[PDB]
Amino acid sequence: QLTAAQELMIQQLVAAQLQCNKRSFSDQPKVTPWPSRDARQQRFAHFTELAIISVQEIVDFAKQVPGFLQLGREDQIALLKASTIEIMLLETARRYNHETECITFLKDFTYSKDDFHRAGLQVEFINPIFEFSRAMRRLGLDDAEYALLIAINIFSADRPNVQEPGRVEALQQPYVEALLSYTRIKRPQDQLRFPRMLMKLVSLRTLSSVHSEQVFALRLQDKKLPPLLSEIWDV
Numbered sequence: 001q002l003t004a005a006q007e008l009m010i011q012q013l014v015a016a017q018l019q020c021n022k023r024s025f026s027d028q029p030k031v032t033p034w035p036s037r038d039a040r041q042q043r044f045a046h047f048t049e050l051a052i053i054s055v056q057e058i059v060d061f062a063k064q065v066p067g068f069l070q071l072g073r074e075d076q077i078a079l080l081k082a083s084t085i086e087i088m089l090l091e092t093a094r095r096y097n098h099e100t101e102c103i104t105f106l107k108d109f110t111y112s113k114d115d116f117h118r119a120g121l122q123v124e125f126i127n128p129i130f131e132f133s134r135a136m137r138r139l140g141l142d143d144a145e146y147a148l149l150i151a152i153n154i155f156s157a158d159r160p161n162v163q164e165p166g167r168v169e170a171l172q173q174p175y176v177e178a179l180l181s182y183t184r185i186k187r188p189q190d191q192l193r194f195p196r197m198l199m200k201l202v203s204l205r206t207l208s209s210v211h212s213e214q215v216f217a218l219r220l221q222d223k224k225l226p227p228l229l230s231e232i233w234d235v
C-alpha cells in the first residue's frame with residue numbers, strides 16, 4: 001500500500017543514514033580513548049568527541065533529507081540547532097542493550113549508567129536518558145521508522161528563530177504520512193504503535209529541556225564544551 005513516492009523516500013533515508021554512519025565509524029580512531037584528574041577529563045573529552053562525530057553525522061544526514069536544502073540557510077541552522085540533541089537521544093536509544101543495560105557507540109564503546117556519570121553527566125539527565133531508551137526499545141523500531149522519525153523531528157515548525165514555519169510544517173507532513181502508512185503495513189493488528197511512536201517526539205522535547213539544565217550545570221562547574229558543541233548548546 002506504500003506509494004512509489006513513499007517507498008523511494010524511505011529507502012533513500014535508510015540508505016543515507018547507513019552511508020553517514022559509515023563515515024562516523026571511520027572517525028572512531030580519532031576519539032580520545034576511554035580510560036584521577038587526567039582520567040576524569042579524558043572521560044569527559046571522550047564523550048564530547050563522540051558528540052562532535054554525532055553532530056557531523058546529523059548535518060550529513062539532514063543535507064540528504066528531501067526538502068531540507070529548499071529551506072533558507074537561517075532556518076536550516078535554526079532547525080538543526082534544536083534537533084541535534086533530540087536526534088542524539090534517538091540514536092542513543094537505538095544503541096541501548098536491555099540485557100547489559102549499556103549503550104554502545106561506534107560499535108565497541110559500551111557505557112552503563114555509571115559510565116555516563118563518570119563522563120561528567122548529572123543523574124537528573126542520565127536517568128531520563130535511560131528511561132527513554134527503555135521506552136524506545138519497547139516499540140521495536142526498525143531502520144525505516146528511525147529514519148522517518150528523525151526527518152519528522154528535523155522539520156519542526158515551532159523551533160525558536162524559524163523564519164518560515166509554514167514551509168517547515170508543509171515539508172514535515174509527507175514524512176508523518178509515510179510513517180503512518182509504513183506502520184499500518186508493518187503491524188496491521190497494532191494500531192496503537194504509531195501514536196506511541198509520535199508520543200516519543202513529545203518526550204524528546206522534555207529531554208531537550210533537561211539537557212539545557214545539564215548544559216547550565218557544566219557552566220557552573222566550568223567544564224568547557226568544544227566550540228562546535230558550545231555554538232549549538234551554550235547560551
Ligand SMILES: CC(C)N1C(=O)C(NC2CCN(c3ncc(CC(=O)O)cc3Cl)CC2)=C(c2ccccc2)S1(=O)=O
Binds near residue numbers: 007008011012015
Ligand atoms: C541505493 C538506494 C538508495 N536506491 C534505492 O533503493 C532505489 N530504489 C528502488 C526502486 C524500487 N525498488 C523496490 N522497492 C521496494 C519493493 C517492494 C517489493 O519487494 O515488492 C520492490 C522494489 Cl523493485 C528497488 C530499488 C533506487 C532507485 C530508484 C529509482 C530509480 C533508480 C534507482 S536507488 O539506487 O536510489
Ligand SMILES: CC(C)N1C(=O)C(NC2CCN(c3ncc(CC(=O)O)cc3Cl)CC2)=C(c2ccccc2)S1(=O)=O
Binds near residue numbers: 021050087088106
Ligand atoms: C553536554 C555534553 C557533556 N554532552 C555530551 O558530550 C554527550 N555525548 C554523547 C552524544 C551522543 N553520543 C553518540 N556518539 C556517537 C554516535 C555515533 C555512533 O555511535 O554510531 C552517536 C551518538 Cl548519539 C555519545 C556521546 C551527551 C549526550 C549523551 C547521551 C545522549 C545525548 C547527549 S551531552 O549532551 O550530555
Ligand SMILES: CC(C)N1C(=O)C(NC2CCN(c3ncc(CC(=O)O)cc3Cl)CC2)=C(c2ccccc2)S1(=O)=O
Binds near residue numbers: 059062076231
Ligand atoms: C549559531 C551558529 C554559530 N551556528 C552555526 O553556524 C552552525 N553551522 C551550520 C553549518 C553547517 N550546516 C549547513 N550549512 C550549510 C548548508 C547549505 C549547503 O550545504 O548548501 C546546509 C547545512 Cl546542514 C548547518 C549548520 C551550527 C550547527 C552546526 C551543526 C549542527 C547544528 C547547528 S550553529 O547553530 O552552532
